[PDB]
RNA sequence: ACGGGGAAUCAGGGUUCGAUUCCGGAGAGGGAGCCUGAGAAACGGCUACCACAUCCAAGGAAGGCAGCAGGCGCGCAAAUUACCCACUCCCGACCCGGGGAGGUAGUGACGAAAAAUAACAAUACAGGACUCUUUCGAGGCCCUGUAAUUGGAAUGAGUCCACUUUAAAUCCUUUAACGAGGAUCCAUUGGAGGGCAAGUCUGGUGCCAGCAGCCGCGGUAAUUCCAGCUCCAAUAGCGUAUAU
């Protein structure tokens, strides 16, 4: 007997057909277009969407006026709206089924860096997060797959400790200045 | 430059102390060492820094903020009456014996071999 | 199903319990005969002693001499004919060398070319035979 | 007999592997991959010959 | 075949597993007998016999790791003869003592989560939306990619102090200082006839060697062998065997 969790879940599912070339291309479109790193994380968001669909289907089977469907219904719509993937005017359980996969990747923080014009490229956005340059509400985020919420959308900017922000210069800039005046004096 | 806020503050009549969770704001510099928080709270609550027992500090990712936990006692006789002695040894007022937990057990059962007053002779 | 009575459960269940034995895959998994005849004994791999290097002929127009070894397992004491997998790998193996042998892949079934051989060598003298083939490691003597 | 063991691999001429610059790995490998598959394509009549294809 | 709560896999049904941290049971080498106690047929308690084995002065005496470590053996198959009672609790005459219960480290690609191995700019270019030109070309209002072309900008791996951390440490987080242009600080594992993503490339071999789960390839121009080149898939992972 030990005091620990042992509660581990997998976040993705490998596809059935391994070499369906049609399937290989839309996965490659999403990787290059959203600057992903491997097929895993595009399978991850597909697994994240897979639950929400089947968790919505299971409520579509029960009748209306069912307290289970009524409570769990808007509770699921609460989270999808608070992450800005569903619009508040379309809040009804039958509209989640029509929601597709690239709507989620739009809410990924890496894309929001490129969407707000703070990065030269969707690939330049990922190195800014991996180098601890931006922050969300006074919290330096180190992860591009950070799902930004709808209300925390407008509070994305550079961290105050960053040469790209109002901070000290980097290691290269302080080295280009040391020998710049050391060679001159 | 460091600022201290008090949270979840409540006094203990059952322990003759007051207790609160500390969060320090130290943007740009290292997490403040514990001995320094003592006098800063002493300036805060109008007390002596030696009756200030703080611990459990762990800065958040990205720096700037460190949440710690601190005790403030009514007097020094209490601070030695109800306190984990390991936290007293953080201040040099308590020092535990230098016998490893292993050596106390070989000496324990070696005295079980003898019966009577000769138990004190086997030890060393 | 044939009988759809409301209370024909023990008639339906005893039938499948009976007819299951006519399934070839099921019958070998629930009788000792397949497990006792298995030289491994349900193990995925096994160590044995190589005692001779025998060359096996191929069968159909695919004509060649397949290089194998006659291994004697050390847990049971049975003798099996392992197949030295890759090219020019017979010169690594010598006589009286303990070798880790594994199944071939068809789970107790001769594979393609070789007649009646169900085992292949993977390691020799506790070094992977693939490492010997790539030259990553060499035989210590 | 089994005397002609390793015949071919022993008599295959050796050619030293020539050194080449390392490929971009990680997400940069997929950036290089996405580009020369979708954006840089040119519309040409006839069946698109394979990537490694060379006649 | 310890049982169950459960686990794996599934459209709906199912199928398979459950020694394994929770509950219940059983047992301390094999059987048996019993003392003490509220509670035991107790084994880190006794008494036998059986098996095994230690010390001996040969008269005797003594033993039970299916506790924590560790060793041997067995095998396809499994870690340190470490630190501590601070936490969790338990026991005692007890605020005070003890607890290999337990906790903390070490080993640990069992497995799970996150996530680097580059970003940007200029130049030559290869092009694309636009105007003229029946073409040719042109500028770039706008770009797109490619090129040991050049350029400074950004950080972490690592080194490394201080603090925090903790029972004392370590790790993470925090702070400084050094720390990258083939940013040599160099990503492997498999495959490229079909199934099945990807060369009728070059050399060697010549039903030999070998490949190949299956269909098959190889007897002198091998898309299948051995290699080089290139390419494909997944990516810190991938291949093989076996159970399901």
From TrEMBL, chain B:
One of its GO terms (molecular function) is structural constituent of ribosome. GO terms for biological process: translation. Residues 87-97 have a biased composition (Basic and acidic residues). Residues 98-116 have a biased composition (Basic residues). One of its GO terms (cellular component) is cytosolic small ribosomal subunit. Transmembrane segments: none annotated. Keywords: Ribonucleoprotein, Ribosomal protein. Residues 87-124 are annotated as: Disordered. The keyword Ribonucleoprotein applies. Belongs to the eukaryotic ribosomal protein eS24 family. PANTHER family: 40S RIBOSOMAL PROTEIN S24 (PTHR10496). This is 40S ribosomal protein S24. It comes from Oryctolagus cuniculus.
């Amino acid at each position: 007997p030990v005091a620990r969790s042992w509660v581990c879940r997998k976040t993705y599912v490998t596809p059935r057909r391994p070499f369906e070339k049609s399937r290989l291309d839309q996965e490659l479109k999403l990787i290059g277009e959203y600057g992903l790193r491997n097929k895993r994380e595009v399978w991850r968001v597909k697994f994240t969407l897979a639950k929400i669909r089947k968790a919505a289907r299971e409520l579509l089977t029960l009748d209306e006026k069912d307290p289970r469907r009524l409570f769990e219904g808007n509770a699921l719509l609460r989270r999808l709206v608070r992450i800005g993937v569903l619009d508040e005017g379309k809040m009804k359980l039958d509209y989640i089924l029509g929601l597709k996969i690239e709507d989620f990747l739009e809410r990924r923080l890496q894309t929001q860096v490129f969407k707000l014009g703070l990065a030269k490229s969707i690939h330049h956005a990922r190195v800014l997060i991996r180098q601890r340059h931006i922050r969300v509400r006074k919290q330096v985020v180190n992860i591009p797959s950070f799902i930004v919420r709808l209300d925390s959308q407008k509070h994305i900017d550079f961290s105050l400790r960053s040469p790209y922000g109002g901070g000290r210069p980097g290691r290269v800039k302080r080295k280009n200045a040391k020998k710049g005046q050391g060679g001159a004096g | 430059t460091v600022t201290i806020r008090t949270r979840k503050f409540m006094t203990n009549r059952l322990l003759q102390r007051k207790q609160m969770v500390i969060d320090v704001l130290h943007p740009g510099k290292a997490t403040v060492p514990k001995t320094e928080i003592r006098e800063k709270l002493a300036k805060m609550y109008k007390t002596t820094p030696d009756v200030i027992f703080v611990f459990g500090f762990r800065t958040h990712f990205g720096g700037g903020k460190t949440t710690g936990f601190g005790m403030i006692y009514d007097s020094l006789d209490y601070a030695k009456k109800n306190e984990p002695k390991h936290r007293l040894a953080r201040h040099g007022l308590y020092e535990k014996k230098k016998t490893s937990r292993k050596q106390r057990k070989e000496r324990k059962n070696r005295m079980k071999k003898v019966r009577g007053t000769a138990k004190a002779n086997v030890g060393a | 199903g044939k009988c759809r009575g409301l209370r024909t459960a023990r008639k339906l269940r005893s039938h499948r319990r009976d007819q299951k034995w006519h399934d070839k895959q099921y019958k070998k998994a629930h009788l000792g005969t397949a497990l006792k005849a298995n030289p491994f004994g349900g193990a995925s791999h096994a160590k044995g002693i190589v005692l001779e290097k025998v060359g096996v002929e191929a069968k159909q127009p695919n004509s060649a001499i397949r290089k194998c070894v006659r291994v004697q397992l050390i847990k049971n004491g049975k003798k099996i004919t392992a197949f030295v997998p890759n090219d020019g790998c017979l010169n690594f193996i010598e006589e009286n060398d303990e070798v880790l042998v594994a199944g071939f892949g068809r789970k107790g079934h001769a594979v393609g070319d070789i007649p009646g051989v169900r085992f292949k060598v993977v390691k020799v003298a506790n070094v992977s035979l693939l490492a010997l083939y790539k030259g990553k490691k060499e035989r210590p003597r | 007999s089994l005397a002609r063991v390793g015949k071919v691999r022993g008599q295959t001429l050796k050619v030293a592997k020539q050194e080449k610059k390392k490929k971009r790995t990680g997400r940069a490998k997929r950036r290089m991959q996405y580009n020369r598959r979708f954006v840089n394509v040119v519309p040409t009549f006839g069946k698109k010959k394979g990537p490694n294809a060379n006649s």
